[PDB]
Each structure stands twice: as structure tokens, then as C-alpha cells.
Amino acid sequence: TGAGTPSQGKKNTTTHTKCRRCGEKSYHTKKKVCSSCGFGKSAKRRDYEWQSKAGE
Amino acid sequence: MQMPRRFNTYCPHCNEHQEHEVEKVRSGRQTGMKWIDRQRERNSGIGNDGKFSKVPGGDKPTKKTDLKYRCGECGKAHLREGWRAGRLEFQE
Amino acid sequence: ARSAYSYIRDAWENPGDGQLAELQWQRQQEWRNEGAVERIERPTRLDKARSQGYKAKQGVIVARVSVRKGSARKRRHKAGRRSKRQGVTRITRRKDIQRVAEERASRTFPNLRVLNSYSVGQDGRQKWHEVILIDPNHPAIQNDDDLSWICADDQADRVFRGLTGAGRRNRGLSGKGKGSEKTRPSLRSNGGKA
Amino acid sequence: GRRIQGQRRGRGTSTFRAPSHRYKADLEHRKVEDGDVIAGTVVDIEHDPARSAPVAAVEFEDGDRRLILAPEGVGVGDELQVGVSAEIAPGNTLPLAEIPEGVPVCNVESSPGDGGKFARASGVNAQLLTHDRNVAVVKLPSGEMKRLDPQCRATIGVVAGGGRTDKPFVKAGNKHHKMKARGTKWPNVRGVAMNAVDHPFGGGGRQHPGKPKSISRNAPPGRKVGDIASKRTGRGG
RNA sequence: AAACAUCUCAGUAUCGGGAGGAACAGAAAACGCAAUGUGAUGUCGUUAGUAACCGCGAGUGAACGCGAUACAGCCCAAACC
RNA sequence: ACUCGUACGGUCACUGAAUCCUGCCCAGUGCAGGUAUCUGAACACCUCGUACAAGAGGACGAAGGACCUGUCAACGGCGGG
RNA sequence: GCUUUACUGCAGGCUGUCGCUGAGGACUCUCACUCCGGGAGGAGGACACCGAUAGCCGGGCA
Ligand SMILES: [Cl-]
Ligand SMILES: [Cl-]
Ligand SMILES: [Cl-]
Ligand SMILES: [Cl-]
Ligand SMILES: [K+]
Ligand SMILES: [Mg+2]
Ligand SMILES: [Mg+2]
Ligand SMILES: [Mg+2]
Ligand SMILES: [Mg+2]
Ligand SMILES: [Mg+2]
Ligand SMILES: [Mg+2]
Ligand SMILES: [Mg+2]
Ligand SMILES: [Mg+2]
Ligand SMILES: [Mg+2]
Ligand SMILES: [Mg+2]
Ligand SMILES: [Mg+2]
Ligand SMILES: [Mg+2]
Ligand SMILES: [Mg+2]
Ligand SMILES: [Mg+2]
Ligand SMILES: [Mg+2]
Ligand SMILES: [Mg+2]
Ligand SMILES: [Mg+2]
Ligand SMILES: [Mg+2]
Ligand code: NA
Ligand code: NA
Ligand code: NA
Ligand code: NA
Ligand code: NA
Ligand code: NA
Ligand code: NA
Ligand code: NA
Ligand code: NA
Ligand code: NA
Ligand code: NA
């Protein structure tokens, strides 16, 4: 079976959804963890220095 | 080659010819307290130790003469250039 | 004349001899069965405690913390590393055990602040330190001219910023002259070289 | 290279775990205050999914209902006893001391009260040879002479289901069904049939181990494969 | 470093913990232009690419002092009650 | 984790239903056992050195190695004259 | 990426030593410590575990 188009047909599973805490469609309803803000994993807000250039 | 144990020659100390006695330089023992010894201990750590991770070079086919010429009257020795000699045996 | 306290001090100069030796052999049995942070009603080394700021007063707290002995509990590299950075066994943390102890205690009492701490011995695999913490919100402390300083906002989380006695020594701030070129005023402003 | 299969095992992931939630009971000798008065009645005989051997359901006097490691010859209605004064009949459990030498035994404790550790698989049995006030010498199914505290409890008889190994699996499918009830990864791909990156015997233009198969006891995981610390190999001699 | 292992990139990137409006440091078990001398601590200029480190290779790299800025000095533990 | 498991077990490998069979080789390499003697680190110990210290040397000697043995359904070998 | 008796190192295993650690070149005991037991108590025991270090093995890994 082709890994491309033919394998795209079984994709009717809901995972990432609108997050209660940040509003982004990143709350993974299976993991109950937001990949954008960290809700469900961290009380503190998800954030990293690599999200911007080193000297900025 | 052969070489006399004693023979007349110039003494740089006495500043005049006198009988000298020839001897092969016996290696001196290390004390292990030289600066390089302390640097070895100090600088060796986790991982490769740079220069201290190296091992004994090798050998030239024939070594040069390594001798001491001792004045028979003032007892002071002097060193000379050596020359390649597969073997050096003294006469008497 | 000699204070009674001087006797506690003198006994602890040699925790392995005399009566103290036997107390320890007895005590540790119970300690090894206690948790990570145990609040205790009275300091095991009263002289040491009073010397560091302890006062039999409201808002003054003491707790004994146990921490494992030894070097860093470190995981081996999982990617490329030059030989120099491949070690695991001999690497040791730069923060001493006493300091680890002070932090574990402070976290246990989120509202209190660390005043100081001292050692109370060790067995073969762990060390024990008693930490003196203070309630900066209790009026009995806010009115004490000797301790009220610890109530100021800039003293919040002092232990986590190395403002503790053990923190400052471990930071290389003991000496005022030769040797402290890279430690004072801070390790960070000096580029992290001490 | 990559971690070898033996290393994937230790992580305890689903593929390597036993289907514990599907198991029935953790067979262990009952605890008796003392006296031995404890007796019960066999209420049923069941299949043990973790051992491919039968096991017995027992209702004890004090109301307790527990499955038991069943020796051969135990049936519904039988009365089993557990204690120092237990009669000496198959199916009963008592300390090696109260057991007459020369009698076959199973589910032997390693340390008094641990509930039984030795001789528990199908049809096996231990052999109580010597007694004493200090040591009870038992011969385990492997043939080893084991010195045990005479206070160690045991069950009289040989374990039920003997002869299971006599029948060949014949087909892959039968192994399959058994393997599905154990904490094991099956089937087994030979190391020499793998790539170098996956196993020390992997690689090559044809199939053969790279080095000799006998590996040192000190070899690290990832390398300890083949014949581990073999004192010898082959059949000759 | 014209490869590379110590070294270098660099205690940098990145990660964990935490404070403030600024942090941190701070009233000598200092300095050691050795003195009949200086006098808490930051910082700026300089000292100086000097001393020191280094397959003594490539590279690395202070401090005292001095001129400035701003200046500030105190509280316990104990003795005796 | 294996494991609600316990040698009729389960781990680690090789070969790959049945049938007839599976010879010779332990020198090298691997594993394993033994070991008078030899070798074999550090601590403690002894000697020298230093009012201390660095350092040099001795005594003792673990695993390991030398040495001996077992082992090929262990890696493998089975020629020239 | 992969290999190995390439170079150099790093995990891991084995082994000595020090700490925990106690009483009277081989030995007993019990009190730490470890395991079994619901408990009483039983087994083991200054060893083991753990922390530190030293020698050997060490393409398992960089
Ligand atoms: Cl010569
Ligand atoms: Cl704090
Ligand atoms: Cl099977
Ligand atoms: Cl001055
Ligand atoms: K590099
Ligand atoms: Mg794909
Ligand atoms: Mg090194
Ligand atoms: Mg600053
Ligand atoms: Mg069970
Ligand atoms: Mg079979
Ligand atoms: Mg399965
Ligand atoms: Mg296969
Ligand atoms: Mg293939
Ligand atoms: Mg490989
Ligand atoms: Mg084949
Ligand atoms: Mg083959
Ligand atoms: Mg380069
Ligand atoms: Mg160069
Ligand atoms: Mg630098
Ligand atoms: Mg200076
Ligand atoms: Mg006062
Ligand atoms: Mg337990
Ligand atoms: Mg490689
Ligand atoms: Na150094
Ligand atoms: Na706190
Ligand atoms: Na430093
Ligand atoms: Na192969
Ligand atoms: Na280059
Ligand atoms: Na290159
Ligand atoms: Na260098
Ligand atoms: Na001047
Ligand atoms: Na051979
Ligand atoms: Na052999
Ligand atoms: Na590649």
C-alpha cells in the first residue's frame, strides 16, 4: 500500500484541539497536554530560548 | 670499534694536556619532582591527556658515542661530540 | 566560666568518641527510618544553632535533611562527545551536599526562608544536616531586631540564589584577596570561571 | 550500533511483558498462626494460564477460598491440611521437618514462610533426603543438593500435569498460542541472520558468527550473546 | 589548531531553579608599589595582551596599584546577668 | 521487565520437518577450571630522604597473565612432499 | 553508517583497599547493616549492599 495518498484516507482521528488555557488548537485530547502552552504538563507556561535567535 | 680507556688529551679545566679516563655515561635516576612531572599529574584527567597520552618514540639503527672524559689529575670531566658507533669497547 | 553550650560544642569536635559516639550509633538507626525532611522540635547541636542565629522563639523552625553521599548521579552521553566530555564516574556536582540539603528543606517549607544550617553526621551512604528556617511573616520575627532583616522582599528564596552561608562559601566568596578574582561579586558576572 | 533484543527486553514494554491481567492466582502456601488445625476442602480443579498446569480451588475452614499449587492426584471433595500436625498424604503442606525422608515433595520454600519457590512446574518434584535439627537436605529437580531450614514448608507429592513436555508442538501455530500466555517475544530471528548494526553476530556475505560464540562472564550487555561463560561446548568428551 | 586527541569554539548555545526595580557584592583570618605604607564593596579608565597558562603549538589571560564614580558603617554567638 | 513465573522453568545462541547420518584436529583464537613457581595496583606496613613533605626503594600479593588442563552441534582447520 | 588484535578514551563486569564497622593467616560472637516472617521470631553478619579508590577485561559505546 502506498505510504502517500492511499494512506491519507484513514485520518479521521481527533488529536489536537482548542486549548482551554491558551486558545491554540494544540491541546492533544489523547494526551491531555497542550503542545503549545504546556497546559496539562506544566503550571508554568511553555517557553524556550530557541524559539528566537540567540542574541534576541 | 675499540678505544683506549686512558689517553693523553686536552683538559678544558686544567687548560693543558693530561691523561684522561674514558667512561660511558651511566643514566641518572629521575627524582619525579621536576616541573614536567608536576604538569603530568596536574593536567591528566578525564579523556585523552594530550601530550601525556603519547608513548616512547623508537630507535635509530646506530646510536652516537655517549662518553665522559675525566682528567686524571684535577678529576674534572668534560663532554665531547659523539660519533655513530655500532659498538664501543675499551682497551684495558 | 565555661558555658554549658561549650560542652555540646566540644563533644561534637569528635563525633566518633565518647558518649556522642554512642548517641549517634543509636540515633542514626531512627534517622535512617525517617523521611527526607523531618521537622524537629529542638536542634541536635544547640550551641551550633544559637551560634548561627537560632532562637527558641515563634517562627523559628529546625529540620533535619538526609542526602546521599558521593559524586554526581550522572547519565552517560547519548550523542557525540570528545573524550574529555565522556566521563560519568568521576564527575562531581559543584554544589556541596549541605547546600543540596538546605534547598530540599526550603522547598518542603515554601513559606519559610533558610537562615543557616549545620552538619549532624553521616553513615556510610548518606549525610544529615539540620537546617534553620524562619517564618518572615510571623510578627514575633518581624519585631525581632536580630532577625527581622530576613523579612525583606529581596531575601525571598535566598537559599536558591546562593545567599546562604553555605551558599557564599561554596561560591568562593570566603577570601577577600588573592584567589577571589573570578568569584566576587558573582560567579556569573565573572563569566562562570570559579 | 543499535541495542540488541536482549536489551529491548529489560525496558518492560508491552511486547515483553506477561499478560498478568489474564493470570488467576499467585500460588503461595497459606499462613497459619500455629497448631496446624487449618484444613480445607477441594472445591474445583482449574487450568493455570501462567503454568499450563492444573491448580486446585480450596475452601478453608475459616472461610478462606484460595487457589492452590496442585500436586498430582488431588480431586474435588478431598480434604487438604496445612500445618505442623498435618497428616502425611499427597496435597498436604507441612515443614520439611515433619515430613518423612524419602518422600517426593513440591512447592518448597526457600526461606520459611516465603510461600514456596522450588519445584512448581508440571510433573516435577524435589526429594527430601536428609533431616537434622539444623538442616534439611533436599534434591531439587535440576539434581542439585539444597540445604534448607527444616522449617521451610512444602507440599507432599509431585506437581500435577507431568508429561506435558512429551508431546511435540508440531506446528508454529501451537507454539504461538502458548507463547501468547507468557512474558516472551516470539518467534526468534537468529543473530547471524541480522545486520551488523543489530547484533554482534550480524553481517557478512554469508551467515556465520563473526568471532567465537563463547563470551566472557564480564562482557557488557549488548555484547553478552551466544554461549555465556560456557565451561564447554559440543557433545564430545 | 589548515588532520586530531589536551587545547580551542566556551562555561558560549541550550536546559533546571529563583529575586528585584535593579540584582549580586560588602566593612579584611585583606593588600604585600615590603612600607614610618594602603584601608568595606561594585563599576569606569588604566595597569596590559604585562605576570601566568599551553601537543610551550595554535591559542588563552589576571591581579595589586593608580586616576575616577559613589561613599557608611554596623548586628549576633559567648563571657557576666 | 522476566514474574500471579521456579529447571517438564526461562534466559542466550546455533541448526532448521521426516529418513540414513554427523569422521579427524584443542596448535592459534575464544570460553571455562586448576595453578608449586614467575609476573601482578593501591591502602596499610618496613627502609632511605625531608625537623614535615615531595621522592626513591622493600616486604606482602587480589583478580588477571605466564604455565597446565577441559572444550569444536566454540571461532575455525582437514595440505605439500 | 559499519568493522576490528588501528589510535585514544568511556560505560559495564571481575578483584584488592578505605568508610559504614562492632565484641572476643586462620576463628567465634552480636550490636550496626541485609534478607525471610503478620507478629513473636528466624537466616545471614561486620561480610554483603551503598559511597570512594586501585588493577584486569572491556568496539557494549564515543
Ligand atoms: Cl658510548
Ligand atoms: Cl529560602
Ligand atoms: Cl515453550
Ligand atoms: Cl597600597
Ligand atoms: K572539539
Ligand atoms: Mg514514511
Ligand atoms: Mg586521562
Ligand atoms: Mg555586577
Ligand atoms: Mg504468583
Ligand atoms: Mg524444545
Ligand atoms: Mg506477548
Ligand atoms: Mg529463527
Ligand atoms: Mg540481510
Ligand atoms: Mg557491532
Ligand atoms: Mg546457513
Ligand atoms: Mg552458518
Ligand atoms: Mg581543525
Ligand atoms: Mg599543529
Ligand atoms: Mg578560557
Ligand atoms: Mg594582587
Ligand atoms: Mg542586643
Ligand atoms: Mg523485603
Ligand atoms: Mg567506532
Ligand atoms: Na590545575
Ligand atoms: Na521556602
Ligand atoms: Na576556577
Ligand atoms: Na556474522
Ligand atoms: Na583546518
Ligand atoms: Na577532518
Ligand atoms: Na594544551
Ligand atoms: Na604610586
Ligand atoms: Na585449538
Ligand atoms: Na583451546
Ligand atoms: Na552512511
- Residue B69 maps to which CATH number? 3.10.450.80
Alpha-carbon distance C76 to D128, whole Å? Answer: 50
- Report CA(D197)–ligand 34 centroid distance (Å): 12
The structural domain count of chain B equals 1
Q: How far apart are the C-alpha atoms of D3 and D199, rounded to whole Å?
A: 8
Alpha carbons C63 and C115: distance in angstroms, whole number: 12
Residue type, C24: Q
Superfamily of domain D160-237: Ribosomal protein L2, domain 3 (4.10.950.10)
Taking only residues 77 to 96 of chain C, the set having a beta carbon closer than 8 angstroms to any beta carbon of chain B reads 82-87, 90-91
Buried b (16+ CB within 10 A) or exposed e, D118-133: bbbebbbbbbbeebee
CATH number (domain holding residue A44): 2.20.25.30
Residues near ion ligand 1 (CB < 5 Å) are B 24, 65-66, 88
> How many domains does chain C fold into?
1
| Neighbouring-strand partners of residue C175 | none
Measure Cα distances from D161 to D44, D107, D120, D125, D169 in Å: 16, 14, 11, 12, 16
Residue numbers 85-144 of C with CB closer than 7 A to any atom of strand E:
none
Q: How were these coordinates obtained?
A: X-ray
CATH number, domain of C116, equals: 3.40.1120.10
What pairing do the DSSP bridges indicate for beta strands B77-78 and B89-91? unpaired
Q: Which domain holds residue B29?
A: 1-92
Q: What is the number of alpha carbons within 13 Å of residue D167 lying toward its C-beta?
A: 8
Q: What residue has cell string 497428616?
A: D87
In the beta sheet, which residues pair with residue C127? C67, C122
In chain D, domain spans: 1-78, 82-159, 160-237
Domain total in chain A = 1
> What one-character-per-residue DSSP string does C60-88 give?
EEEEEEEEE-SS---PPPSS---GGG---
3-state SS string over chain A?
A: CCCCHHHHCCCCCCCEEECCCCCCEEEECCCCEECCCCCCCCCCCCCCHHHCCCCC
Distance between CA D24 and CA D18 in Å, rounded? Answer: 13
Residue nearest to nucleotide G12 (CA to C1'): D220
Say how far apart CA D73 and CA D68 lie, in whole Å. 13
Report the distance separating Cα C191 and Cα D59, nearest Å.
75
Half-sphere exposure for D39 (CA within 13 Å, toward CB): 11
C-alpha cell at A2: 502506498
Quick check: C65 and C129 in contact, CB under 8 A?
yes
Q: Report the residue from C83, C90, C91 with minimal CB separation from B48.
A: C83
Question: Is B47's CB within 8 Å of C84's CB?
Answer: yes
Phi, psi for C146 (deg, rounded to 5): -95, -25
3-state secondary structure D37-53: CCEEEEEEEEEECCCCE
The CATH number, out of the four listed (3.90.950.10, 3.20.20.70, 1.10.3720.10, 2.30.30.30), of the domain defined by the range D82-159: 2.30.30.30
Interface of B with C in 30-49 (CB under 8 A): 45-48
**C89 CB-contact burial (10 Å; exposed 0-12 / middle 13-18 / buried 19+):** exposed
- Spanning CA of C33 to C1' of G10, the rounded length in angstroms is 37
Cα C83 to Cα C91: distance, rounded to the nearest angstrom = 14
The backbone region for C16, taken as left when phi is positive above 0, alpha when psi lies in -120 to 50, beta otherwise, is: alpha
Q: In Å, how far is C187's CA from the nearest CA of chain B?
A: 24
- D107 vs D102: CA distance, rounded Å: 16
Identify the DSSP state of B73: T
In terms of residue numbers, what domain contains C44? Answer: 1-194
Architecture of domain D1-78: Beta Barrel (2.40)
Is C118 within 8 Å of C162 (Cβ atoms)?
no
CA Rg value for chain A: 16
Contact indicator for D98, D86 with CB cutoff of 8 Å: yes
Q: Which three cell numbers stand for residue C36?
A: 527526607
Please report, rounded to whole angstroms, the spatial distance between the CA atom of protein residue C31 and the C1' atom of nucleotide G20: 15
**Does an H or E element contain D104, and which?**
strand D104-106
- DSSP element (H, E) containing C10: helix C5-11
Dihedral (CA of C15, C19, C22, C27) sign: negative
Instruction: Residue C48: name the closest of C84, C15, C88 by CA.
Output: C15
Residues written for chain D: 237
In angstroms, the CA D124 to CA D118 distance is 10
| Residue A30 lies in domain | 1-56
For residue A48, the number of C-alpha atoms closer than 13 Å in the C-beta half-sphere is 6
Torsion angle in degrees (nearest 10) through CA of C60, C62, C67, C71: 50
CB-neighbour burial class of residue D70 (10 A; exposed 0-12, middle 13-18, buried 19+): buried
Interface present between A and D (3 or more CB pairs within 8 Å): no
Q: How far apart are CA D14 and CA D183, in angstroms?
A: 9
Question: In sequence order, what are the residues at sequence separation of 6 or more whose Cβ sits closer than 8 angstroms to the Cβ of residue B65?
Answer: B82, B83, B84, B85, B88
Rounded Cα distance between A45 and C95, Å, is 28
For chain A, what's the residue count? 56
Nucleic strand F under 7 Å from the C-beta of D214? yes
Strand-strand pairing, D214-215 and D227-228: parallel
Residue D153 to residue D93: CA distance in whole angstroms: 7
DSSP secondary structure of D64-94: -EEEEEPBTT--TT-EEEBSTT--SSTT-EE
Bridge-based pairing of strands B16-24 and D126-130 is unpaired
Q: In sequence order, which ranges of D79-189 are alpha helices (DSSP H)? A: 172-179
Separation CA B67–CA B26 (nearest Å): 9
- Preferred mutation among B43, B44, B46 to probe C, highest tally of C CBs within 10 A: B46
Report the alpha-carbon distance of residue D160 to residue D123 in Å, rounded: 5
The C-alpha cell 534439611 sits at: D136
- All cell numbers assigned to D168: 511435540
Chain B contact present for C76, CB below 8 A: no
Measured in degrees and rounded to the nearest 5, phi and psi for residue C37 equal -125, 115
Set of cell numbers at residue C116: 543557616
Cell of B5: 680507556
Closest chain B residue to C91 measured between Cα atoms? B46
